[PDB]
Amino acid sequence: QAVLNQPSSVSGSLGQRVSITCSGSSVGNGYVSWYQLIPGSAPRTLIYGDTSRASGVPDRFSGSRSGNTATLTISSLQAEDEADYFCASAEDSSSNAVFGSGTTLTVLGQPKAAPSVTLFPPSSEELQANKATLVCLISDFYPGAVTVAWKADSSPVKAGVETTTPSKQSNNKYAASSYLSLTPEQWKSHRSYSCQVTHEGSTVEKTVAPTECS
């Protein structure tokens, strides 16, 4: 039950350097390895033995130690480095290791990007299955902070709504999704529905109407 404590969040500027610390529970008897976890991917070993790089690890990733405190340094921060990082160490002849609390790295100074918003009304197939789901897809924005509101005839809607937290796309920009689950009767009981996406002092609103084909 060795305690390897990391800062929960660290931020650095694009192209600059950043450090993620891994401090011990209190005689550092084991070496520290580091790991990179990008959602949707399996973990990636970066550093082992305090300072040795693994295979395919760029040179900007570097490790160092200072008595019970191991540091992962990323010298030239890139946008693809935004990820979760975990240190680890084995504290005995036991074939066991302990992982650090983890650090979520934020890369600032990336190009801001207004969101694109796509609003799909319920498909004819789903409507014929006696269901109606409005699907609001939000893509290609940075930073990854949006609030999503739904409207029915310009009246707010809070029930039957589900929204996903923004996550990175393959191009290092963010995307989010929101759903409005209705009954077919409710779908026709209004003249229009809107998805409103607020992002950095800007609101993009897309609208669909049961009386007009998408």
Add this chain to the structure above:
Amino acid sequence: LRESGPSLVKPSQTLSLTCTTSTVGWVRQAPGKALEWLGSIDTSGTTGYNPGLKSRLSITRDDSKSQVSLSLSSVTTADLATYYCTTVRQQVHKTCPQGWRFGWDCGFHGYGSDDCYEDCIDILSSQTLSAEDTYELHVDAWGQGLLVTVSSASTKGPSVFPLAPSSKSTSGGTAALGCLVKDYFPEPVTVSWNSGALTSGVHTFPAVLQSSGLYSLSSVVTVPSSSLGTQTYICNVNHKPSNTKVDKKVEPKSC
């Protein structure tokens, strides 16, 4: 390293997984939690286990079939996690205090050569301290990760609906089309496009969990607008927990 086994195990039951290959360990991660070591086993069969879990943990290996096994008994919702098959490198390193030297570094190879000696050569029958141990363990390679849900609820396959583009939802040269994967359980659902040939502009979203206890997600691809009238786009939904594969062609709306 191929994680195989059920994606759903009922409470109180014993989860059992296997990792086909051709020193292996297991790591897991519960949602919003740090990585958690589980155990490993080398060619000599020796086993090590996370002390807090060794009661329920059981790991085996068939060098014959090249298959390592994990068995976690009496599972609870606390064992809901992604389970990773790994490869481990372990190497204990021995060092002597500053000045002190190993017997073999002084030239002595009799009994006690691997201990540290303050007085080198000079009547080696001197003060002898055991060498200090520093342990180095790290995961070499990671498996893709099998998601194991722990719940009494029953498996349910997904219903897939098309997210078709229309004349007003285009973005000039580009257009969005997708698939809505509704009401499945448990996670995960994997989505590809055109059986893996279409990978650019594709984004598959994380799933939402509805008040019904069921999951839903969407996958979208940005394609050229001009090609829509004749191009064929198919989303491939795979839900291994129900052994369900659904391919759905997404056509543009006639409006």
